[PDB]
Amino acid sequence: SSGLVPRGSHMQFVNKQFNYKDPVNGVDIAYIKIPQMQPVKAFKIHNKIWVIPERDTFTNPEEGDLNPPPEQVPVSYYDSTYLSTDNEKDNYLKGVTKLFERIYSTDLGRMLLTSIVRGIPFWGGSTIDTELKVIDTNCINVIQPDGSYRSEELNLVIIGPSADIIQFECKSFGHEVLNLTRNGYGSTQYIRFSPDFTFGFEESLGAGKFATDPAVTLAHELIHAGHRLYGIAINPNRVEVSFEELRTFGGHDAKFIDSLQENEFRLYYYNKFKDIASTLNKAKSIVGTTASLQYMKNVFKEKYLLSEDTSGKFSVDKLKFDKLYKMLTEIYTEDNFVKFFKVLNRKTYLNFDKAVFKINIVPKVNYTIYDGFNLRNTNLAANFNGQNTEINNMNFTKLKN
């Protein structure tokens, strides 16, 4: 028993209680192709969001294998056998499902996931300045039971890790000339993640040995995804710890980005949103697509909170932009999720992870949507005992320091 529906009749964000062996149907369970590869079985957990319970040998051409390199950076972990069996893929799918529901059980996660679903990558794929056109790399190819393909736009893919099992990240396909994550456009985000492993850190209150709640780790990557879907990510050359990481962690770490620099970023992306507004205004035709130009223009009015005058012309409202920008960069942070979950967590991004642990969050006797590891009305409830790797030893198997 997984405890996927602690209140009500059905899950509130994830659309189906999937099992990995559920048959393909071309709608929400399907073999798919990323625009070479063999088709992979994938599950549509929500509008715009798919889960691929496979190790990621696809996204990067130079990372087509799970072979470790010659001994390897200190904080890393390899096991070519992880996520090769159907039982494992089923557990991965239910684990990721459970974590989306935990995130969506908080006010902050409802906000974040809503922003993510609304953040459709921009139709900036035309070489002709007056035509709206999709960008092919913001789509997947979805196969039907009869074997036909159809192209489907999406915002987010959660996929298994590549060779280094604990290297989680949020990445995406680039464009020839456009910087999609830094020009307001956005692009489909691929998050390498596993619910089956987590990290250790030390905390006094002798020093205790604790484990990071994987709902916090997923929320971290979803926060990056939000930045990148709205095309407002910080240049990764701004640093090593990047400004983008400090921003995403939040708390007192974020304060270290100086307020004048912040003002300068905000102005840059304000102007980038104005550029999107005029592109939409100068739009004359659409290729795609049986949807009208007016309809697609409106999808993006909705995404970017654009104002529309009586003439039907679009503009960026300074107050609505400040609101959206602030939500994505200041409110959606790891530190704020820690506060909502009421879990123990590293106090700064700079903290060194001690260990890696194997975990299994799918049974509700191990981990809940409401309490994570720190189960209410038990000995695990007090003092973050559920996250304590010695007190709650049965939930954490040390694989490495």
- What residues are designated binding site for Zn(2+)? 220, 224, 245
Active site residue 221: yes
DSSP state, residue 75: S
If the CB atoms of residues 56 and 245 are measured against Zn ion, the closer one turns out to be: 245
If the CB atoms of residues 249 and 300 are measured against Zn ion, the closer one turns out to be: 249
- Does residue 215 contact residue 340 with C-beta atoms inside 8 Å? no
**CB 86 to Zn ion: min, Å:** 31
Binding residues: 220, 224, 245
Phi-psi sector, 69: left (phi>0), alpha (psi -120 to 50), beta: beta
**CB 181 to Zn ion: min, Å:** 14
Beta-bridge partners for 150: 142
If the CB atoms of residues 51 and 191 are measured against Zn ion, the closer one turns out to be: 191
If the CB atoms of residues 245 and 253 are measured against Zn ion, the closer one turns out to be: 245
If the CB atoms of residues 104 and 193 are measured against Zn ion, the closer one turns out to be: 193
Half-sphere exposure of 182 (CA within 13 A, CB side): 12
- Does residue 40 contact residue 54 with C-beta atoms inside 8 Å? yes
First to last CA, the chain: 32
If the CB atoms of residues 101 and 245 are measured against Zn ion, the closer one turns out to be: 245
Q: Are strands 285-286 and 149-153 parallel, antiparallel or unpaired?
A: unpaired
If the CB atoms of residues 125 and 250 are measured against Zn ion, the closer one turns out to be: 250
Active site residue: 221, 302, 330, 390, which one?
221
**CB 133 to Zn ion: min, Å:** 32
Residues in contact with Zn ion by the rule CB under 5 A: 245
DSSP assignment of 134-189 equals --GGGEEEEEPTTS-EEEEE-SEEEEE--SBTT--EEEE---SS--TTTSS----E
Environment class of 247 (CB within 10 Å of its CB; exposed 0-12, middle 13-18, buried 19+)? buried
**CB 239 to Zn ion: min, Å:** 13
* Host H or E run for residue 334: helix 334-341
**CB 235 to Zn ion: min, Å:** 15
Helices 259-281 + 293-304 axis angle, to 10: 170
Beta-bridge partners for 308: 314
Euclidean distance between CA atoms 333 and 110, whole angstroms: 13
Q: Which residues contact 78 (CB under 8 A, 6 or more apart)?
A: 66, 68, 72, 163, 164, 165
DSSP state, residue 351: P
Give the rounded distance of the alpha carbon of 2 from its chain centre: 22
**CB 242 to Zn ion: min, Å:** 8
Active-site positions? 221
